[PDB]
Amino acid sequence: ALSDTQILAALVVALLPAFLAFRLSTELYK
Amino acid sequence: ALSDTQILAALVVALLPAFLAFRLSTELYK
Amino acid sequence: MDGSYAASYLPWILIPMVGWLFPAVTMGLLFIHIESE
Amino acid sequence: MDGSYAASYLPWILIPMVGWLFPAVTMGLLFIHIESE
Amino acid sequence: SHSVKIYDTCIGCTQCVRACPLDVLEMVPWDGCKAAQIASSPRTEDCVGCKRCETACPTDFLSIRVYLGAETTRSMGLAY
Amino acid sequence: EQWIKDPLNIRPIAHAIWDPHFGEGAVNAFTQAGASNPVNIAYSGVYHWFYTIGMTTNQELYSGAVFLLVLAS
Amino acid sequence: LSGQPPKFGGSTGGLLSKANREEKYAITWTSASEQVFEMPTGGAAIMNEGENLLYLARKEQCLALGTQLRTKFKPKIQDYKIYRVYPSGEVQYLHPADGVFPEKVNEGREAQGTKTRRIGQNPEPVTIKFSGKAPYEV
Amino acid sequence: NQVVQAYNGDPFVGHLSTPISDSAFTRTFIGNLPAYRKGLSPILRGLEVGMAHGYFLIGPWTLLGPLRDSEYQYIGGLIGALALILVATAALSSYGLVTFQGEQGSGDTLQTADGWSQFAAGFFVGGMGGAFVAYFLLENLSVVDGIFRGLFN
Amino acid sequence: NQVVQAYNGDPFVGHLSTPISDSAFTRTFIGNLPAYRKGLSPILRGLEVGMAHGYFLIGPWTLLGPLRDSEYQYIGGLIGALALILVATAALSSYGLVTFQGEQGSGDTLQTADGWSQFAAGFFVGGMGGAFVAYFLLENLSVVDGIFRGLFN
Ligand code: CLA
Ligand code: CLA
Ligand code: CLA
Ligand code: CLA
Ligand code: CLA
Ligand code: CLA
Ligand SMILES: CC1=C(/C=C/C(C)=C/C=C/C(C)=C/C=C/C=C(C)/C=C/C=C(C)/C=C/C2=C(C)CCCC2(C)C)C(C)(C)CCC1
Ligand SMILES: CC1=C(/C=C/C(C)=C/C=C/C(C)=C/C=C/C=C(C)/C=C/C=C(C)/C=C/C2=C(C)CCCC2(C)C)C(C)(C)CCC1
Ligand code: SF4
Ligand code: SF4
Ligand SMILES: [Ca+2]
Ligand SMILES: [Ca+2]
Fold first, then answer.
1. CA distances (Å), F64 to each of B21, E53, F53, I10, I52, in order?
2. How many domains in chain C?
3. Terminal alpha carbon distance of chain A
4. Does an interface of 3+ CB pairs under 8 Å exist between F and I?
5. Which domain covers residue D7, as residue numbers?
6. Where do the structural domains in chain H lie, given as residue ranges?
7. Do the Cβ atoms of G40 and G64 come closer than 8 Å?
8. Helix axes B4-29, F58-72, angle to 10 degrees
9. Disulfide pairs (chains A, B)?
10. Under an 8 A CB cutoff, do I39 and H67 touch?
11. Which of these CATH numbers, 1.20.1240.10, 3.40.50.300, 3.30.565.10, 2.40.330.10, describes I5-149?
12. Is residue E33 a known part of a binding site?
């Protein structure tokens, strides 16, 4: 099986592609 | 012991020093 | 807080009023007053 | 919908958000955006 | 505003008028000393009350006095 | 009324505690000097002074309190 | 209020809401040489060639700036003017109120703030009781 | 490539144009909160501010309160939240009575006596409504759980 | 030492300046009720007037009603109070529709059609909110008693 906190760790790690995707898409919008 | 209505009688009597203290303090404020 | 003495409901209503209504009303009126004009 | 896997509350909160909050917020922002100026 | 008063014992040494940060004071002509000048306080609504003018006065006791009073925006040194 | 029976044994109660913050432990701890409510033990010595100057019933103290309300008025 | 502003990068020390609700102060000085001064708000700036216009929030900051313009520069900048500008719009003229700096006797100023006695002959508060005055101003 | 300029091109105001204070996302987000959004009447922005805080204030006493270990767990939280929204609206209206007595312009519709009174009214309605709707979701939590999982569908 | 002068220094208006009608306490108190307080928008003064009456109207049917001797004692009082606030707001809005149809000035923001409509809206919101909050305290009376005495603390 898999741990409870590994899922939340994956979520807080994937918060970094969220920020970088937001900033890349904003910079493409220019 | 003491009565239930003697306490409320004391409260409605002490409503008179409340009014006179309010009016004395207002008159001192002049 | 049971009250064995006479008129035990009277502290029940007067501790909120002297604890909240008297401070909230007095500080509200004084806040309107010291900052008026 | 019981969840045997780890963090079963996580789909419980993320299916409403991706189903409603993401569409309502995204269409609201895009509706303000495509109709601005 | 604070009131800055200058008394007869001024020797016109100019120390107070250049020790003052806000330049409240200024020297005016006078006939009562060798230096032929006495400090005046024209723009005394700009006095903050720092008393660097009293600190710089050499005459004893003091030829310049600051008398702290009704505070304002200018006399409290508030940038906000 | 109770204190002027045996003033050596009973502690004089000043007034009653009424605050909504008390837990069960504080209510049982502050129930003292023969009361049901939580009470404060009087250390001002007004009980001894009232007992010495001849006041021996709650009605005498109530009449004194109303009289002093009228005097303050 | 003519003058290009100094090349300053901005700072948190500076003009609060006091500047656009009540008075703020402008110091105007002219220098030939470009150099670096310490703003009393904190930092360092660039003196432009020619006229400068620096907006500050206190008169003490303007006079502290003018003081360091006078004493910290070998080509001393003494033609500095301090204004008090209001958000309503009008501009006052404050520090060199006469022609010459306050240390020098202009011979056309008026002796105000001068008492005709020393502190020993100051009246005493018992004489002026309930008069609405105080022992200096009598 | 400097990212910290002065605020709005003014180098003597006491503010820097940092990536948090004066970014594009911050301008579009802070400038679109109800306190700053353009064109709204004060009643609707006060209403939207109020609900965001009534829904918030339910939780702290619900999970951490004198009643959190009894059967009236949510009623104590709701009572505490109504107490806090009551004193919040009293403070808001007192602030309106105090600050906006000298006559001012209408550049912003919120910074005036009528505007702040509308804001306080909207804040009260929204705050008590948000508090009661969070109480209603929390009290009927079995129902919300069952409908999000599909126990009744 | 005369305490009854004419009203506002005018000896021909039909009013006396008695210690009840025109005292300092009366001026500061009547003139600071929501119907007379300065600077308020009509929505907030209507809201404050409304809550003072919704909280009031709960009691008479709760303690003296056809349902006062049943298990739905407070629901009958709440239903009666909503009926009364409904007809009160209908009367208020009808009064606004009737009185403020001929165009008038804006010396007082409450005595105009938009102002009275805002007052009626605020009165409705406040009245129903005060009625429901008095119902919520009365229905959850064991909880309020226990938290004021300390049965859960
Ligand atoms: C001297 C007055 C005094 C009194 C009487 C109280 C009493 C109370 N405190 Mg408080 N406290 C006080 C001073 C006081 N405190 C001070 C000075 C401090 C700061 C150190 C605190 C710090 C403190 C904290 C941090 C907390 C308490 C809490 C409690 C409450 C415990 C039970 C509860 O859940 O209540 C629930 C709340 C209430 C009963 C408030 C009244 C609100 C309801 C809705 C009644 C209003 C009715 C209606 C809406 C308006 C009617 C209008 C009227 C004219 C008819 C209790 C009522 C606890 C709590 O739950 O607080 C919410 C708690 O967490 N107190
Ligand atoms: C992909 C996302 C998705 C999800 C998660 C849902 C889920 C749901 N649908 Mg839906 N549906 C969707 C897409 C979705 N649907 C689409 C695309 C269609 C169109 C074909 C439909 C068509 C459909 C119909 C026609 C109906 C459902 C209904 C249902 C609900 C069944 C249980 C119920 O009574 O809920 C009750 C409702 C809710 C839980 C909605 C949430 C409202 C509460 C008050 C939560 C809000 C909390 C608070 C007020 C705000 C909080 C703010 C927050 C920031 C904290 C369930 C929640 C049924 C239903 O009852 O709908 C109401 C039903 O009749 N759906
Ligand atoms: C002291 C700190 C503290 C404490 C103890 C809590 C405690 C709580 N918060 Mg809170 N909160 C806090 C601080 C805190 N909060 C802070 C700092 C904020 C940010 C400002 C929040 C924001 C927040 C939100 C936004 C919500 C909570 C919720 C809750 C509750 C979740 C646990 C529970 O049993 O609810 C049971 C769990 C639920 C009821 C989950 C429901 C979640 C939503 C409604 C379902 C998804 C539907 C979707 C949003 C529908 C909207 C769109 C649709 C209309 C189309 C709990 C009482 C929830 C709450 O109050 O629910 C009533 C919740 O929604 N809080
Ligand atoms: C007998 C007249 C009367 C009555 C029934 C009320 C009734 C009420 N007013 Mg109040 N008000 C009055 C006169 C009165 N007002 C006066 C003379 C002033 C002018 C200073 C105010 C100014 C005032 C403010 C600024 C606000 C209220 C609001 C309220 C509501 C709940 C809070 C409150 O005051 O507790 C009930 C109070 C009493 C039973 C005693 C009333 C007498 C004092 C002077 C009230 C003072 C209020 C105080 C400044 C702040 C509220 C304290 C409260 C939160 C504990 C309620 C409808 C608040 C509200 O919810 O509005 C939307 C609000 O924001 N009032
Ligand atoms: C036909 C005449 C009549 C009748 C039968 C009643 C009957 C009732 N009234 Mg009412 N009332 C009337 C006329 C009448 N009223 C008049 C003429 C007015 C003046 C305009 C009032 C003003 C009045 C008030 C202001 C209140 C009552 C209350 C009540 C109830 C008290 C008895 C009970 O079981 O409540 C149980 C007793 C309580 C719930 C006591 C609670 C008292 C407060 C809320 C606790 C103290 C907390 C404090 C105020 C918090 C505020 C500040 C805080 C936020 C910081 C009862 C249903 C109370 C009520 O509706 O409560 C829901 C009450 O608060 N009435
Ligand atoms: C089909 C249209 C329709 C419907 C759904 C309603 C619905 C409503 N109106 Mg109404 N209204 C309408 C047309 C309608 N209106 C017309 C044509 C007039 C112009 C004369 C009014 C004028 C009117 C007033 C002045 C007020 C309402 C308000 C109300 C609300 C509750 C009271 C009520 O009227 O009972 C439900 C009524 C019906 C189902 C029948 C509607 C048709 C008649 C003509 C309504 C007449 C209302 C009457 C003058 C006073 C209300 C009576 C009520 C208290 C029993 C409710 C939302 C009141 C409210 O709460 O507003 C905040 C309010 O103050 N309305
Ligand atoms: C996102 C984000 C954020 C935020 C956070 C959060 C978490 C939020 C919160 C939120 C919230 C907090 C929300 C809430 C909501 C609410 C609601 C939605 C409510 C509603 C209400 C209602 C429903 C009401 C109504 C009513 C009733 C019911 C009755 C009474 C009256 C009235 C009418 C009013 C931040 C900043 C970080 C930034 C980033 C992003
Ligand atoms: C003092 C005085 C007086 C008076 C009397 C009395 C006794 C009064 C009454 C009072 C009252 C009668 C009060 C009341 C209060 C109320 C309240 C405080 C309420 C609140 C409300 C709320 C809470 C609401 C909210 C909401 C909700 C909940 C939901 C729905 C919606 C809304 C949002 C609205 C006289 C004249 C003699 C004069 C002298 C002094
Ligand atoms: S410092 Fe004193 S002595 Fe010197 S000029 Fe000023 S007042 Fe006169
Ligand atoms: S107190 Fe300070 S600012 Fe005022 S005149 Fe003296 S030295 Fe100048
Ligand atoms: Ca507990
Ligand atoms: Ca019956």
1. 20, 65, 12, 50, 40
2. 1
3. 45
4. yes
5. 1-37
6. 5-149
7. yes
8. 20
9. none
10. no
11. 1.20.1240.10
12. no
